[model samples]
Target chain A: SLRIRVPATTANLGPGFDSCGLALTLYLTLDIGAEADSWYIEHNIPHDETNVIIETALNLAPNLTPHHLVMTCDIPPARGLGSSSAAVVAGIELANTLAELNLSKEEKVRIAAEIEGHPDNVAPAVLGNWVVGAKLDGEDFYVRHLFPDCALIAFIPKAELLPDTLPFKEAVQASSIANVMIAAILRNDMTLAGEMMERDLWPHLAQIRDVAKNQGAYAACLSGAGPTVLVFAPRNLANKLQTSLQTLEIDADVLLLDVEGSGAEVFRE
Target chain B: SLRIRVPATTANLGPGFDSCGLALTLYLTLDIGAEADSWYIEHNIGGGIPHDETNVIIETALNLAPNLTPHHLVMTCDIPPARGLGSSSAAVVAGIELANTLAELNLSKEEKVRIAAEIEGHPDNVAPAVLGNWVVGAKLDGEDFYVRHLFPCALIAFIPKAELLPDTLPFKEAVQASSIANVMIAAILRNDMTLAGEMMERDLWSQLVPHLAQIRDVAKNQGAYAACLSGAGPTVLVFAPRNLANKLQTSLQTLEIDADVLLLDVEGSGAEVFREG
Candidate 1:
């Protein structure tokens, strides 16, 4: 049997827009069993491939025989989390392993980028941790960094704000805020990085920053286009902040997540 | 008396726009002489720059402290003026060092940068003049802060006869430029010049540099890792190995472009002070 797992991602850590993203601990996993007499599939989400993972696998390896498959995910769809991207990445890995295509890491990302439209989520799903990516004419480039000292505390509200569900600048000073944020992260000054992170230049900052920051979650901002919020704080404090958020009794799912350094993984079980 | 040597600075290394800067070896040097009855200034190979008490160096020094004592000053410079090579910031920094010495302001290096930022209204040129090497900075929380790192490379500038007068960035263009800027900085921090160099071309398409495409093409053809417009440019700067820098110079001379191509050291140390009793 083959198992493929991809992490959920939060794009545009405030000012990064479509240029940067962080991979979260939540995942979409696909468990593929040996070929069956016919098509035996058991899954709950409608995917181009979930009903999405297999369609993609067959699209790539068309001649392959049907197989028994089971897929499960904890990542909430259309909540500004990368529900679609995780499914897309899982699909590619499935085809990659089954078709014996044996694609290189960059090639897989490139092929996926063409399909998914951009790389902000695709890159991090493949390589966990946080990433700053740039798309070029000939190829795309991603510079990855692993920050272990911090943990992510996410506030996932019950509402959905996806493209099929719902929707989403300053010019110079706006850009400067982002420019400084990127510089701050690369220099490893989370004090300033946290400062820049919250000052994503914001509805979230107005709504929840004071309460979140008051509890020592130094950084708190919208996750992606956020109806959901994310805070990066010390691992120990992350629990405290989650409790702090729970007190407000905001209608949301409060979860504490560790950094995922390993991107996506495929293994035999 | 004290002598201050401030290296010339080049701002906005491509995608950096107004957020990054580097120090070049060319210098604006001030040699402080004996105390005089009043501010006395002398210049070598200088014009359009003051040689009297009205000299910006003297005026700025007096501005820092009106009660400043008088000193006889001799100034020399080879850093080209008004050509986007930070001639003005050099003089501004030289003046700050001048006041710091005479007034005994005893200001911290960080203080020097803050004052310079206020004077220029931006940190790009002034920060590099004070901090030296490669400087990444932005005005944050209504205050100025910078992170300085040493970049290992040689610099070669294309100095042209025509000087550049500057200009605003459109909003959409600004975001596009900044997205590329984010990547350029990361690539540079990752120490991958090849990736950094690629973004330079993609970052700035607004500012008119007729020679950029040809110059960048040739510079990279000769193994120059990065080629970019220095500051507001009519001049182009290339970051490369010393050997390639030397070869890149003559190869460009064959391109029929009218410019002075010379290798410059990366001035890792900001302004150096020598005191003489």
Candidate 2:
């Protein structure tokens, strides 16, 4: 039997739509064994082999044997926290374990990207820290960098916000602002980066960002295609920000998350 | 009397479009003094630069001081005009500096950048020429213009023999591929020069300007870290580490390329009043 843990991720990161992603402290845990065929959920986790993770794993390695699986999680789904990507990554890890596949990190990311139809979510989920990816001319490209030492807080809304698909041209045009955002991030100018994020096309996330700003966040934006607001501040200010978010009284899960530095891990159990 | 010198600038450094600029080693020098009764040109700088009161330098100065006494102006310029190498920006900044000195406008660097940007209708070249260093200037919401400095880097220039008239060429919007590459290049430039080099190799500037394609390839072949067209270029700027610059300079000389190749460093300071009395 083996236990695997994968961290949740936040994609888009305001202006880097389909380009940037960051792994969070929230995680999904799974225990797998080839000795039996049973399933149990300790938290709000999937119950069957039909889950995206296992299903994706089976798709990659059809010879994967059935197994007893126990799953638990802390990340909230359908709130733009990359819960779905966490599952897909876990499935691939499970396949690697059951099929005895020695897939490299690059291979896993490529496969996960193909399955997810985009690389932003899966790349960071696998690579950890921050990842930038682009799909062009039938191929996927990605570069990974470590996240800066900063505090990240997620304001997860109780209601779900569905993804808004745009036409191909429109999507490309909308994403143009991402170039400036990336430059600012590379220069480590959080003020400029934050401004660019707030300038993003999604105005619906404005109120949450305003609240986060009032609380002294260095930067804030909608995480992925969010109802979840990701706020960035210096590590020392995390507690103060939490207090401010509490004062706002929004109906959302306000979590101060650790910046996860590595991807999925496996351990004997 | 004042002697003002402004370094030539290169704008749009690939995908930065109208946002990024760099100050180069080439210069425009002007010596102005209120020693005459009428605006007079002491040097025969032909090519239709007005020798009368209406000269750009004098006109700009008068804009600040209507009753200012007449001055004699001497111009010595090394920056080539109509080559997309920011000769116009150098000239413009020279005018503003002259005006500031004569009228005692006492403009701050930021205020001068704003005024120059308004006069030229863009800040890419003007900002860097005024502020020195690599600068990124962006105007958002139509009225708010911002300028910030970036880390300095080195450069080599390939100046072609032919001159190009500014604004005689049509401006084309960059395609999707080029824009994407630009973003990647801008980000990489701040972190890794090697990767930034690779991005510059794939820039859209070459595709838009046909002659630039081979020159860029030559620079890379000669071991430049990165190379691209300078402004609406007849000059191609190549990035290389200090150690490799001299070797690359020699390599460029042997190619028989139809350009004057110069080894130039990025200027850390912009226009300066070198002699004031």
Candidate 3:
């Protein structure tokens, strides 16, 4: 049996736009064995033949043959917490293993980024930690890693606020804003970084971010194209922040999160 | 006798418009002593600068301390003016330091930068002129200002013998169009000059709008890490490794462009004050 686990990811950490991403503790797990060919999903997850994992695996390895596949996930779907990217990474890892076609992490990341159309989420989901990705020589992608010292707190809203079609004007402006914020973050100047977060383009989440700031988060902003708000704070303040979040009575699922330093890995059953 | 020497400054440094600056090896020197009240222009400098009460150093010193005794002063300027090489900023910093010395104000470098920014309306040039390194500064909430030092890189300034075309000297609103890549900022912080140089050329928001474009084009082909307008420009600044300095100079000469090229290292100290008793 092959057991593969891939961590969920959060992309666009404020000004990072399509360039920055970090892996989080939430995960999607798959246990596979060469028995009778079938797919079973635990936790009452509705299994679909067109699921990303199966489709991606077939795309990579057409002769994947027969197997018993069990899928389990803790990541919330359609919530900007990178559940789809987690699924994609898991599928790629499975394809690499079952096809017996060994692919380097860079090659896998390139394929994953091409499928996703952006490396922001998939890069960290495969590589782990914070990744600064840049597309070079057209199709080829490159990434650099940084180990962020702080913890993250995620606040998932009940409904989506971003429109399906993103505005180009905002995208241009966001890249410029991210440029300065990236500088502040690189220097570890939280005050400036936090200020840049509060000054982001996510006007709808302004008040929710305010709540996190009041609760002692050093900085707070949307995670990926968010409905999921990620709050940055020192580790020692996590407990107090949770207590404060409960008092606010916002309709959300709040989880104290730590960054997963390594991405998809094979582990014992 | 007190001798004060201040380095020339180069401001704006590509995408960091109005925020970044670095000091260069060119300098302005002043030798002063309280023998008597007098101003003497060295044989090196001609009639272009004021020699009496209206001179910048004397006027600035009096502005800080009116009752301070007069000193016989000799001034020597190595930085050329109006070419955007921060000749004006060097003078301003020199004046402020001279005032601090003459009045015994004992102002810190921070205080001197504050005063200089107040006088000049921006800290990009003056901060580095006072602090002797690359500086990134921003005005916070109108009244307060912040500055942080950054890594230093080598530079070359190609100064046109004549001022740049008047229209090109001042950038219009399109400067925002040349948004520098954030990866370049990360590269600079990481001390990856090769990558930083690659991004510096990506700065389209400078005076190279039309005429100056050829300078950057030629320099890059000749292997400069990065090149852009120094301060408001007319003076093209090139950042390259030490080995490429002479190669770039020969290339600049081959272009037959009418400009004076000066190879200078980034200065590591601001203004130096020495006493010879």
Docking class of 2: incorrect
lDDT of each: 0.77, 0.72, 0.72
Per-candidate clash tally = 6, 1, 1
Candidate 3's TM-score: 0.77
Q: Calculate DockQ per candidate and list them.
A: 0.37, 0.20, 0.17
Per-residue alpha-carbon lDDT of model 3 for A125-212, expressed as tens digits? Answer: 8888877665543553334556558777888767564433334334333444555566667777666667765655423377766776
Model 2 C-alpha RMSD vs. true structure (Å) is: 4.7
Native-referenced TM-scores of chain A, all candidate models: 0.89, 0.89, 0.88
Candidate 3 Cα errors over 4 Å, as ranges: A35-46, A57-68, A100-104, A133-143, A161-180, A201-217, A266-269, B30-74, B92-123, B137-153, B164-180, B204-224, B243-257, B271-277
Scored by lDDT, the top model is 1
What's each prediction's TM-score?
0.90, 0.83, 0.77
Candidate 2 C-alpha lDDT tens digits along B57-143: 677667767877787878888887766778888877888898788778899888778777777776779988988877755544243
Over the full model, what C-alpha lDDT does candidate 3 score relative to the true structure?
0.72
Write one digit per residue (lDDT tens) for candidate 1, span A181-227.
87777776777777776656524445567777776676887777767
lDDT of 2 by residue, A166-245 (tens): 33333323334455566566667776667766766424356656777776677788888877888898787798787777
The per-residue C-alpha lDDT of model 1 at residue B12 equals 77
| Lowest lDDT 10-residue stretch of candidate 3 chain A | A163-172
**What is candidate 3's CA lDDT for residue A265?**
90
